[PDB]
Symmetry: D2
Amino acid sequence: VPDATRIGRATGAKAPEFQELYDFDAAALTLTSAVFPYDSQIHRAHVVMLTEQGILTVEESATILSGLAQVDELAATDGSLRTYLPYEAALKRTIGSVAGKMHIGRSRNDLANAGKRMFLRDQLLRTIEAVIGYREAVVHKAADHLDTVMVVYTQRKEAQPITLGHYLMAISENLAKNLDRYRELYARINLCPLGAAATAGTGWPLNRDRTSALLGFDGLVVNSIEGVAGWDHVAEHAFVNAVFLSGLSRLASEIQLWSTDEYQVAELDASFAGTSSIMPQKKNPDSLERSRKAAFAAMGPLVGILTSLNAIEYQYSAARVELEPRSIDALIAATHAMTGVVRTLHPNKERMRQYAAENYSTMTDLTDMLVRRVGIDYREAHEIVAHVVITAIEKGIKANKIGLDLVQEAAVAQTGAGINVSADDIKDALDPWQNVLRREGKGMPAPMSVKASIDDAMAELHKDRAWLANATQALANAKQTLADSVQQIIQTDRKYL
Amino acid sequence: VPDATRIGRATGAKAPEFQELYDFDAAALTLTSAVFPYDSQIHRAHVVMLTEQGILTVEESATILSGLAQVDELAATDGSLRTYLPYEAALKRTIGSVAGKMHIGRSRNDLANAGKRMFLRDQLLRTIEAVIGYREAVVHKAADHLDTVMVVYTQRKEAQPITLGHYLMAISENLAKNLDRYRELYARINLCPLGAAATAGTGWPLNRDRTSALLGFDGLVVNSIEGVAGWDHVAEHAFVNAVFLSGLSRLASEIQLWSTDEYQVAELDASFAGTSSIMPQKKNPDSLERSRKAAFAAMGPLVGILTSLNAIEYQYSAARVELEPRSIDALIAATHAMTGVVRTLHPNKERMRQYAAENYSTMTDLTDMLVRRVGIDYREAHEIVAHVVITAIEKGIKANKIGLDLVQEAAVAQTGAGINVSADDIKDALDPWQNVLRREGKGMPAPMSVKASIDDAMAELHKDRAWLANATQALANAKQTLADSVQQIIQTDRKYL
Amino acid sequence: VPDATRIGRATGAKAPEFQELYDFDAAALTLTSAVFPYDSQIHRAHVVMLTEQGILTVEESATILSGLAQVDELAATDGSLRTYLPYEAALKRTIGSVAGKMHIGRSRNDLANAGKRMFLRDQLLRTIEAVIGYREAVVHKAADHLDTVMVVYTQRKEAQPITLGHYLMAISENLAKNLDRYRELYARINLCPLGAAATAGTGWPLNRDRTSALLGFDGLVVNSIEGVAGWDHVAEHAFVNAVFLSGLSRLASEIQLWSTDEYQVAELDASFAGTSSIMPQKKNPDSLERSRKAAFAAMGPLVGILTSLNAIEYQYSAARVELEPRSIDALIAATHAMTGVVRTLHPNKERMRQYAAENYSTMTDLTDMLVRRVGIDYREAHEIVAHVVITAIEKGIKANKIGLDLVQEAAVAQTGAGINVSADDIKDALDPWQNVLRREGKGMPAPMSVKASIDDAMAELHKDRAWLANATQALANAKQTLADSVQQIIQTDRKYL
Amino acid sequence: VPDATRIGRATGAKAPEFQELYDFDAAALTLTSAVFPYDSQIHRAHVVMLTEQGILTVEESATILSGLAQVDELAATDGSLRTYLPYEAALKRTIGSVAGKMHIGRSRNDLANAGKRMFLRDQLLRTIEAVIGYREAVVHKAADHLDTVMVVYTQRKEAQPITLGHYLMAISENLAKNLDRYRELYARINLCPLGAAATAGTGWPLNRDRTSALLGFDGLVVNSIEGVAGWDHVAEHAFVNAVFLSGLSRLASEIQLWSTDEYQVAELDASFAGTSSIMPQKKNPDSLERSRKAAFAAMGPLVGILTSLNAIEYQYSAARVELEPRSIDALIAATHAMTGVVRTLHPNKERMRQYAAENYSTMTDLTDMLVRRVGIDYREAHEIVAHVVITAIEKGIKANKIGLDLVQEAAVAQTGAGINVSADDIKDALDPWQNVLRREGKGMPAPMSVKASIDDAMAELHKDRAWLANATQALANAKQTLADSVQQIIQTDRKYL
Ligand SMILES: O=C(O)C[C@H](NCCN[C@@H](CC(=O)O)C(=O)O)C(=O)O
Ligand SMILES: O=C(O)C[C@H](NCCN[C@@H](CC(=O)O)C(=O)O)C(=O)O
Ligand SMILES: O=C(O)C[C@H](NCCN[C@@H](CC(=O)O)C(=O)O)C(=O)O
């Protein structure tokens, strides 16, 4: 059965990234179902630690660990086993009273705080991976468009000429700092609260560093109150999502204006556009607007979480608002969609060049030229070029048809004095590509400086990938350490005891 | 004329920190008036750079710099000179057409972005200084209360025994990570956008690194669009303020509950409390509630700023919302007030000990004891102690009057089986100080572990102060470099030219 | 399998209202699945209108209507048919090309705006029903507690004596105005945008008033742009939810303080409390804190929706954020939970009376008494009673043990003058029940005035129920009109054509 | 000294409404200074009531009232007298101990709640007046543009043809419902809490209805707790401001796109545009973007206020966030600015008509035409017209140059079948003015239906003005009643006592 929205001008299939924006809502897990796999990992890690600490015998531990695998299997289909106390009771029904001993020195409070960290931890690595691929697509696009001259806007008005690659590298610098945020946050998520128990620790001699290590954490939440009352990392995760998505919404809005029927300087790839059921001419930026929607929605969890922390004491509280999987899924779907929008965007290079040459964004360089040459104050040159533009628009003269006559008229009419400049001097000031080439300092649109930025961004992207690989592998290693420590306790009880 | 609110039970004067909460609103500068001193610094730094770059002569530059000092003096009383173009025109009226040349290679867009960074930069150091003193007061208080036994709450219900010092060190760990946020943000605020001009750079050969260095920045905002469109640091500044203040509100709320007529476990210092004009018995937590008010209000700028970024393209925009001085002033006033609240808080140590011994927070250790000794599942011990508590409350027996009889009744009535434990075994489980001493792992309330936390926090506080001192001095040095470079250009033109 | 959380002090089953707070998240529909039943109603209403307008023949219409029933049945299990274009294509696969004619003069834009209104419309009536039952429970509780003397707090400090019924009638007045909000909003939701088509109307001669009427609306969204661009009713719905829930959170917080181990003036019904897996003494206010959580979370949709409207033009937009079913379900679950909390709350009337008599909330009436009798300024009487309290607390004298001696000491020590008042005059001022009875003006706690409020609230509740019944029946009538008009078109084509 | 921003293309002076956006921040009062005039009115009204109730003698009252006038005069310059207790003490210093008697039966809590209502009350009438003039300007503009054909957009893409007047009447309908919100809110602000005293009423026999009436209120906040704890009207005021401004931001954004260099379909009046200090071509929409800024900022108070209510109990609290004067001033400045933007907007009627005729917004009517004539399903006609557009764009044929050949090609190439339609049949479908005229149902762009909307809006505007006039006069009357009652008490004590 075909995608019924792919009709008329909406040709082909939705891009996969584009379809993600339609799928994430229905597919999102509840927080309970997203967190409960991490609970099972904590039960094993905690039990292993109790066995290493002699709080449980190798035989008690082996019994418990074999039962966890059993109840985990029941929980795959019995949703009622995905919260702790029902899970513990099922373990009791499976292996007997020894079940209860897995909760020695532990509470639901530090179990939940830890388990949710492990969830957000994986979702932070998932996010960094998405943002990295988004930066990768932006920089790779920029490298193909060092010569694609076009205007930059301020206040939605044409400002000066630049290049598409220069613009995209603004986004790259935006994302580099957002990746810094996500990495700095990871250092605060990946702290282990286990061992705080309810909020006050316990008399049982737990090895907190061992449980943290077996679960992939890079350190402890030390104080036990902070272990169960700490929630700022949830707030912060919501914020970084919000602010990163605000930049994604601004790129989305920028491309949507580029691709208006009126600008006509870029077109969405067919695979990232839809159409109307009533208006056959529509090529609709559904991917852009659903991506912006995610950015706006991301405000919600941020405010909900912060409101809830402002509402309580510095205690464990069940009143605290969570960052939900469906919010993070929205972020990933939008980042993926915009990664593909950027990769496949089709700029109309000739119309871009047309505006830059015709619609007066080169007037700064005409002004700079009078100052640099005839050496008048920037404020008097400005009034002349301003009158040049006023007169040009009245007479219907595009900026690239402005000549020595008009600049002389304006100079005379505004100062009673002509100006010593050549027709060539003027034509060169109004050449939008020359406007670009003159702008060659750091971070300016001249190809040589943009390419420099690209080289630096490509080196940072390598650092970005290496950081992610390390973080990811550090978790895979602990997770395999834990799995092995579990098979040991179990397999020896079976064979030699 | 005396403070008319200091009547009846509101004895003495408001503490200075307490009074700050009443003064910051009326005293707050507008953003314009707060930023315009930093504009004047940029004019000099920019001019100095133009002179070093030979874009201005030592004589042109000296003229301009002497005029800046003149217009700066006019602006001290003429508020209309605190935005750029009126300021530039006054400079023109002062020194002539050469005035206009200070704007060579520059825009209002990168001037404003840079100037607001310099403002927030100083306000970030001001904030870190306040938070540091807040952490200093919290840790110093904790060190005096390692023996002050009291209950910790979860869900506003007594949970287990701890100490006041253990609690305060939860706050210390909260603030350590908030100081990390503020420091990580400083690295993104202290980037120089100057040289981006409108958004596209310029053909003038500016030395961007020189202007950044003369203005105290630690690096550039490289890409020129990012220089004027970048606003995430404003968003982030608002967030860190919001989340830090959320923790301050939770401490404020905690102390307000401690100091209810019903808890009666702490009392605000007279200098941090008010009273009623109608109810003479009132000792009102005005300092706490006005501090919470600041935390709630801090939500506003955060949402306003993020909404505005979600509303635009990735351009310069005058639609962007700012972080205002009056919001930061509120944060400082509240941090100062709560620093003083904590320093001067008066805990009722006997009532604290009373609750911990009488109101059943020791029941965990009774349960742990049955498991550790008679070696029953935690879930069956739990039902017995739960019935102990149920029976205890019915009969009016406080937890420290619970004895072997009652635990035997409960065990029998719940399992038909007695339990091998001594009267001493039970009295020791219900001793709340022994509850503390047994909780001696990392981050738990036992004095030895809390003291450990304190030693670590004191070492971190030293690192905190050293980071602040370095940041502050790095700005004082650039500011004196700049001042000297200005007096040079001026004094030599006068004497040798 | 029993509820594994019902252990120790958590006796019996969760109340149904209490369990609702655990069930709503997993059970919540997506917006798509919640809205698509209303889409099917619009297809019939629209078709019926086209048939009445002769845009379709009784035979074309009958074919279409019979097919809608068929595809509706397919959609019960095929989730992909719950968005329009896939639904339309299935109708085509069912009845042929005539399927497409149901979209004559219509768009997805006005279909969606209308369908979401019909969804929120039903959810508004559902909400008003919940709030009504919440007000019913509050007033009914108040009527049973006109004599339950207790203190009112300001700033979490005991202020003056009142009654529990007086307090609950503050909530009643809060809810009356929230019901006004919900009713005023209903008048703006129940406007029909159908006939706006994409945004500009259509050349087809639709009878817009007929479609509105067949779908239960009470009027049109007239202008066609406003029909598809209008979203303020979604914003407003989110706000009213937010502000109503803020009051519910304040009652929840109030009861949670009443029921602290320290206040001890109210206890949650066993069926609305939980306990700890580690701490057997816990009677945990899980119902209160999960209700507050809903209130905080309700901030999110409000901010998301408003951000999205601030981000666009006054057009149809797919970037707009929605009010989701899971948010409304949270509101209903919390309103139900707190309805049951209030109905079943157990106040400790003796401890309430104890505080009112012992903890100095009667000092206002002692002050008022000196002014009313010995006729001194309220400010000098205030200083004396304030010193009475200061001295009383030092010496350990509860307010009901304050006598003529102490008031004489304070008067002398503060003014060198005694005061002509009797031991009876003083004992009467400090009688907290007499404090209540003297407060007998409108809205004050004296039984006679509270009962007055109750009578008025009971009359308003009758108006509240009657408004709801009318609104609900007006929709049931249109829905049966529509069903009948459909069976007519279908059954006559079958028999007489 | 001239406005230094009025240079180059920024000709003439800023419009007054435009300048308002630059002035409101520095000029905004603090809440304290904005509310304290209303405090003085309450002192008189309260005293008058006490005198009518015989709680004060005509001589005591006359003394007090004469002193209020004296301290009010001191407060004009002594800012420390603008909070109650300092004010009361100054009254004591002026007229003696009788000063204190003005606080009989009263608190700072119900004084402040009432005084802030009186402030917001006046600011609500001020807002309704601004919004009315904004609607007046929108409707009056629409009446001049029934023939100004132009395209409507959905998703920032051209949708169908309409008229500028049709668009503006969408805004009118938006504002009508926002005026309903403001009026419904006024009924909840204009309730008098005075007589609640601290929260529990008083034993003094106050006539609450008299004080309410003397102060212009239309009813009581009955319950005394609700009188000091009630804050939802503050929340709601913030929301209505937020949602109304969200619509103003959407109009602002719409006009800013119209007036891009690329759309070129409208131009801001010179008096509502600025320019660049560096780019002489800029005509900058500073008025639009500063108006949007206000809309975004208005999110802040809304979230702050709601967070604070979610953070407390249902008590008086000093933690509650306020709606500040500077926020309301921003709203008024933005509403005024956009009122003037709309009044003076210059549409380019020829370019508007050009797009409507050339850029394919008429394709719906071509599709509708094939269905209405050759009588094919809307879905097959849609594919043909879609291919017409695809082919048209490839060959460079504007929609008004589409002819019978191209529609035949598309029909054949898509169905192997030609189509019986005339060249005239097609040219008429593609005539954008005929597209308008055919859209003549309710709320559609045809002149006759828009004019209908205008007539209805003009009648509503009359109702809007009459409601405002009544509300305003009802306050002026009470205020003069009060002034007269004061001069009576004073002038008779002087002459006959
Ligand atoms: O004073 C009373 O009549 C009643 C009393 N008011 C509590 C709040 N007092 C301060 C708060 C502040 O200084 O921020 C205020 O009235 O502004 C009470 O309820 O105890
Ligand atoms: O059901 C809920 O929403 C809350 C529930 N209990 C919260 C409190 N936990 C225990 C500690 C414990 O059970 O180990 C405590 O602090 O009293 C939950 O854990 O989800
Ligand atoms: O008045 C305002 O709110 C905005 C005003 N101008 C914004 C745009 N700036 C220029 C560049 C320039 O002037 O150097 C541009 O981008 O067109 C302001 O600068 O505050």
